[PDB]
Design a protein around this ligand. Structure first.
Ligand code: NI
Ligand code: NI
Lengths: 341, 341, 341, 341, 341, 341
């Protein structure tokens, strides 16, 4: 008879909607606990002796670094398999690879385009698989983000988080869905063209009706920002993206500047700014210089003033990438005793 | 702000009454979880880098071995201080010693006569203190015993444990109170002269009113034994004890033989024999042979036939000393994330 | 006076022909023992504190992974140096690189085209060098493969292993020689155009005289397959290979299908299928889809039916890459006592 | 050529007069550094893999515990060899034993009566030997004590330390000699009968004339106490010691009470109390009760008021036993780079 | 299917006669290899994570130390349980103790009088049990001793080892049997009253027939010493032994002096002296002084001159206790691959 | 109150000018001390549990291997981020990245073009940053080189090091400034066109006025070489460089041949050859062969004869990359006690 009890052990983490509010909060709180342990020098090698594969079909170095430092702190050894090292379903079926990866490694991180690849990995490897970012979901960023909110405010339910800018990018989609599950009010403040899809809004609405989260999807700043505890943003455009100027044109009214922070009406001690990074907040980059020389644009989604102001939590948030991934890997692979969530 | 959550962390374990049924069950289940891990060779060095002081006012080598091996499995180093090494309250106050011990060691085991010494250790050391046996309580034995019961039957509540023999020895006292807390029915079957004291009985009664445990103290063998899922015993006489012959004479009718096992009415798959050991079940000892010449006794509290029967779980129960101590130390000192019991 | 005894210690593994049947069996048996150890969670950090350099002139991720996870299980830390990181003999002589490498690392894996590079590395580095694949030899694969055969059968001598298809591919060449050294009967069933070379045949014939191995090279399916304990195949064509249609047409009759298994005559309890992977057994790849569209071909060297049947050992054999490499690195660098092979 | 540089490595620590002020201060400062490291959770396993013998001819459990916890923190394993385990020069010559101890262990602690035994151990073992207390010297207590003074005041030279009571016991002798080396003024306030010997005073006077330490040996409280930064004491009598009443009679005027603390004229922020322990400061012990029942004596060398007052540093001092022994073992055995003191 | 191969794994070492010459040489050779490893700082934690119980019915500190330091070098943690801690078969049967011991610890050292206790431990504990000395056998000493001979000479077979003095002492008995198994010629030079028993002589004669060992038992010094490669002795009398003066007088002519070495005829490069220790070779003991005063005796079984001469290997042999025990514990518990001995 | 003392702890190593001669000597000597330790297998896991980021804007595999092996020997885990992984200042500011890197990693290596990027890394990361090579400085190469000089000669001050060839390449620049700081006489022997810039010369001059170093920049081979204890060179042309033919033509008279070694006037025991590598000393490379066909050159900056002569120390110098980096990391991150340099 198997007397091991742990509701997370062996589970994959592919999509944040596969986890209940209680499960998400556990992992968030576990992350804050391990953050405290690491600050104090308290050992927590729950993955002692293990091997972990870190698959990236596209370079995602901050996520890699979070998974790497997390693995080491837990006593596991991470190996990076990037785009030149691995191409799933290209010359060998994803299923065949999963099986061989699973026979050698104890856990698998997967970052790549297809959610379906993540699922086959989870189905066939026989080991926990963690989604480091797909086109559909970004669960590790969500864990970090809500950990950061709770780190600052102490209690998630009934707080308001406002995302400004592209309400159709996959971080906004994840924030809307994850906030709904957790009972956090979510405002998406975007141009109409970039409102979340009906499919995304429906998934979020389903969860919100059970949690009591209020969800507002609007192109009006003043309506959107009022009451926010968190103002969150992300980049408007990519490296030589299509319809670049059209996107910038429509997005520029939704820049997080100090006026936007004022529009919330929220007291200073109840308001923070978040950004999943990288942020175009100045011209300190090669890209930044080029954009300026061509358009005279000096900041995009956030002003430097806000980025460097007392509201700023994006650096704590980026550190929390690591602490949250650590709790996730530990819950899921460390054979810890967790009889109940 | 401390985001560490653990209801056990830093707590001492001096008395089983100081723990709720849910806390006791957690520690039992954790012991079973950890027993599995060790069997599988899954690492669990939760006390990595730590030092532990093991104090013994009297030799208690089975308790010592259990704390020792448990400490090593957890990553901690134990140092044994016995009767020739330490004499708490003899020349230096227990308070003074407790403060010094606590400044060098991360945790302290104490086995000695005075509960007050255990309490002072806990009050002044600043570290977890674990009671390896006092005149008043034996909590590690209780964790091992109810762990053993659960390992065999599952669900503890509603089962029936019967202690037969000296109903006033400290294991019987502990079993009565602890079963009462856990909702396990407890029968003490003893001579009238060796019924547990009014205080022990009334402490147990207070817990039983809330848990639903049925408590029976009786001199009637057939009333006592009926319905038992466990038949538990212990030595009749100890260390050339006073009133020796009288104790044996009042006690022998309460020997655990196959005929006693049959009086329970219980089927082979719902019935086990337990004994905290050492046991006088044969003539295989210097003490045993002397008792045969003087008294014609070849077995005392349990016959060799019961001790070697299909019902015997005493050797499992004794290994469980180690696994249960490990759960206790781990929960209390490992800085594990335990938000809710 | 050096009282250390180990026949493997400090030796490079560059070519399977460089070791006797006794030495190869020891490594194989060592691998099956270590596999057992890992399954039981039994520690074996024979390479504790060591650094290992993994050189790959071309991407070879399955091999990279086996070496990585093996290193870690043994307590050594592997660093991957791939094509963008190293070019032996391009800018700096392979000899100079070997010396510096050998001065920092404790062992060196090399995968590259030229056997002479493996030899210069072994000659000049001063550390064990392991050939992860060259144009001439694939020793670690042969270790995995015969470990797999023994895992299924026990005594290797007198068994029959049949490779079907491109009998000129370096896997088939290695199998012929290694099976020859080991006293395994090797059958190569290939169109005459793809028979092993006279040089390959002559090397294997030398070893087989002494071992008693029966070598058969034939284009006749029925004569080749008859009495096979193992049916082994590999890809007909690689990434954008010349003579593509020629190769596919001549190799098509040598597809491992259920009829091919049936042709062996061998009872179910004496017959396995093996494939060094990746295999084209279905249409679950981008490549597989392009072949199905252009040619109507759905499966090549092995049918999905054989691939997913009770005969299939590919995935065990693939896992065994790791266990076999661990034995090889352990014998060769672990400073283990091995007085006699 | 040996490029290792460390002026302490391989040296024994048998007598504090064998070390210069610079060497003593280094070890003191090193102790405060390692204390900081341990509080912060910073690893410092400088004796990783080592075995250490802890010899005690007489039970000295606080010293054992300091050596034990120190060894573990440094990564060394301590084994306790007490009076029933070892009798030097009894049935085997001390020299023969030293040689065998030295061939198995990496370091040796020795606590026993004869300084000459310590020296033979140091001469013949080939490993560092540390004196845990002999009739002649107590170097580990001195390291702890001056570490404690520096921990509180920040700079040893020109401070005043006053020992009150038995100026002939070996801690007072060591304090006088060690204070002289370090440039700390030392007052010994004792009855004339218990003034330090001429031999001890001469050793101290020799060192003091080079350091500029002032040394006062007096039976006058008011002369002795004035200007003290430290008031230090120790027990007047042993367990059933000879001339017990005569010693108590002469010593009782030299009790450290609150009046004595006042006699210093030192401001509150520049005054501390020290005691090497155990202290008879109340009646919380078996011995304490017995002394009271026979003499009505309730406190001896220090009052409870002083022991529990804001001047008290004896518990920090007792913790520092460990931190100081740790620096001593690390300097002397860890193969650290220490080119200069 | 268990693919683990190891002839020693799980086996107890209770009596040297229980192992073949091949097995004994392997252990010996394994010891010299591990000694080399330790001298080079090469890791070998083959017992990583294990707990070991060290039982001593009587104080035996040199043996205790060898086992302790060996355990630690191998990664296992030893706990000492001495006379005040354990009394096998006194209160509790040795069988019951064995079972519980075996359930917590991974191996068990036993030093005690009764061989039957060693056997019950091996039979009931379920773990390897190592005999650290019984009335009948001293295997670990024989391993140290022949390791020492091989360390000096190479090929053991055909060598001559001569024990001088009490040919009835259990060292001499073990040497006769072990030398017999190994094909070493054994000479026992003893007064006729102290010849080995007929039982001891007959055991050794059985083994010598097959090994070709020449056994000589004689009271003639010149015939016994002739051709010796090793002159080995041990104490004439123990702690308060009866027949003291009788024993000393009859044994006095068998003192190992320089004349005894000269009597061998053996060239300096082929002659060593050995003594299992402690040795009475001078007057540097309390005991030695009492013998000098009472009897004028200054040296007994060996002169200081021989003890400190170019022939002396006692201290190497003593260090070798450790290296030989490490090999024995490593072979028997390390789960090392040993397919053939 | 922080009683931690270490002058290096937390400092970055961006430029050799930022360190005093005494600090540089300490790190050199520490490197030699640590080289001995590793040779002896003495543990020195000073960075136990740490994570280190190794950034490379361009491939630099010898520098990488040195940081990697050094990290592992110290107990730290390195992760390599190369040109396809990280692009500092391209899309995210170096400041932003530095902050994130520093929140996850305990230390950062940086190899890239801009010194300003190294400085920003140091300013904003909050961790030690080590310069693995910029356009302006190469401090780890300098530590390795002067470590090598001292390893051969001892005393650095008063010796003479001569760099021959391109007197403007960054190794020559570094050698001039660093020798100047350390009091080593430096001769640059170069064509006039390749004399070090006025700035490099004037920086060196400022250090030489204080140290007593004699600096000579000259085109005269015989004036340059005379009195040299070291002849040091480096490649003439790099990565299909511009002005290629002109560089070779002005450079060839400055080749290191045996005749150059003889012009020093220095005896065989006071003279060594150094080269930071890779070296073009033969035709054993693809690049070498092309240069032979196009130019008739079979060797460039150094002949094979000098490269393989008794003077050659370049392979020692290259191993020393690792040991010197280890000293740097250890002093800067190990939290070692270093009160005074
Ligand atoms: Ni790594
Ligand atoms: Ni221990």
């Amino acid at each position: 008879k198997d007397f091991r009890q742990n509701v997370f052990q062996g589970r994959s983490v592919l999509a944040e909607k596969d986890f209940s509010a209680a499960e998400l909060e556990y992992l968030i709180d576990f992350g804050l606990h391990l953050k405290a342990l690491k600050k104090a020098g308290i050992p927590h090698h729950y993955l002692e002796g293990k091997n972990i594969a870190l698959l990236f079909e596209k370079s995602s170095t901050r996520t890699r670094s979070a998974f790497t430092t997390a693995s080491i702190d837990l006593g596991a050894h991470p190996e990076y398999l990037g785009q030149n090292d691995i191409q799933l379903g290209k010359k060998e079926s994803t299923s065949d690879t999963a099986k061989v990866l699973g026979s050698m490694f104890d856990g698998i991180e997967f970052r790549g385009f297809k959610q379906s690849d993540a699922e086959i990995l989870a189905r066939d490897s026989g080991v926990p698989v963690w989604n480091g970012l797909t086109d559909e979901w970004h669960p590790t960023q969500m864990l970090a983000d809500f950990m950061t909110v709770k780190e600052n405010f102490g209690k998630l339910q009934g707080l308001t988080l406002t995302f400004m800018g592209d309400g159709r990018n996959n971080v906004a989609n994840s924030l809307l869905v994850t906030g709904a599950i957790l009972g956090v009010n979510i405002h998406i403040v975007a141009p109409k063209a970039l409102f979340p899809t009906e499919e995304t809004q429906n998934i979020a609405k389903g969860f919100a009706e059970k949690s009591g989260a209020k969800l507002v999807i609007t192109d009006d700043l003043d309506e959107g920002l009022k009451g926010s505890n968190v103002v969150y943003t992300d980049v408007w455009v990519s490296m030589g993206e299509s319809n670049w100027e059209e996107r910038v044109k429509e997005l520029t009214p939704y820049q997080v500047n100090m006026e936007a922070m004022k529009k919330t009406g929220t007291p200073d001690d109840q308001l923070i700014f978040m950004h999943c990074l990288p942020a175009f907040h100045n011209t300190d980059t090669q890209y930044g210089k080029e954009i300026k020389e061509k358009y005279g644009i000096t900041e995009m989604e956030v002003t430097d003033e806000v980025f460097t102001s007392k509201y700023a939590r994006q650096f704590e948030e980026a550190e929390n990438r690591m602490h949250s991934i650590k709790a996730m890997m530990a819950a899921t692979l460390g054979n810890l005793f967790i009889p109940r969530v």
